[PDB]
Write a protein that binds this ligand. Sequence first.
Ligand SMILES: O=C(O)CNC(=O)C(=O)O
Ligand SMILES: [Mg+2]
Ligand code: NI
Ligand SMILES: [Zn+2]
Length: 331
Amino acid sequence: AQNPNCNIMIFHPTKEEFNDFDKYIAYMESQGAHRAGLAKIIPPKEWKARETYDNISEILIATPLQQVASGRAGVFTQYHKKKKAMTVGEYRHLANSKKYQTPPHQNFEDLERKYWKNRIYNSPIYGADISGSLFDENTKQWNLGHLGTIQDLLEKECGVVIEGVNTPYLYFGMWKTTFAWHTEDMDLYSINYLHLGEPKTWYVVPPEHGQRLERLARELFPGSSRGCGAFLRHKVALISPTVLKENGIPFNRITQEAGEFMVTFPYGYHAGFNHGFNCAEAINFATPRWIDYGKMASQCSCGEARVTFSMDAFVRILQPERYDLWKRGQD
Ligand SMILES: O=C(O)CNC(=O)C(=O)O
Ligand SMILES: [Mg+2]
Ligand code: NI
Ligand SMILES: [Zn+2]
């Protein structure tokens, strides 16, 4: 079995290997990359996402989210308070202000220490989940707006034609902005490209050990667990590496820098934080190997998780027994 310790793997495809996206994902899995839940892909030196980032300041962040924490430094939840709209230029200036800017630090490990010590005492503002793309239309390789759609994959594997679309999303971050522990909708893959700015640190639990993280989360967030049998779908809970180590949960960590791709694999729980002002683009995708994970994915039916239009068909076709209850949660 390849990669039996479930380490995060890093890949350096050549320009020739960067042509065929599906083929390269299947290659990475042949080497055991999925066992970690996360892989890094460094694009060939010839590739670029677009020519420059000099003209992005007028993108609108219609609903910036202030991420307010509750709990203790290593075990907390966050809620998202909606803020007034602002442009990317306005948000960049905010991120760089004395109130929100990255503190002085020695290296990524010192910054990670400071994040876990101090996150809860601040409420950073995240421009998350903005439909759109920063890939130039002429970028033909690993252009996250030109991937094969999940609906087309389901149709190719299973023969059923379904409604829905699959488009990318932009994330504008600042110091301390945080992504809570989660797997993707329907335990899909994700791919995330860091277009510009400061790094993003990731934590990940191997898919084969995801239920260990779930059981710890039920212990640590007991009221949330009683409220919903899949409350990590709410994407609000944080658990620090120190707490994970104290409770024996297998995990790994890695820092993504500008110009790098990360792939999350089906049922790979992940969480992380931004080091400073940055912009990422991410989208979900599927492969043949995903189908079985989609069929087994948990679902939130309490009403909190509320998701996209296109998840309907995935539930309806892959999980018909759960469909009625899940749809009630959506309505
Ligand atoms: O970058 C972020 O805030 C969160 N991204 C992801 O969870 C992802 O790409 O799957
Ligand atoms: Mg602009
Ligand atoms: Ni994710
Ligand atoms: Zn729920």
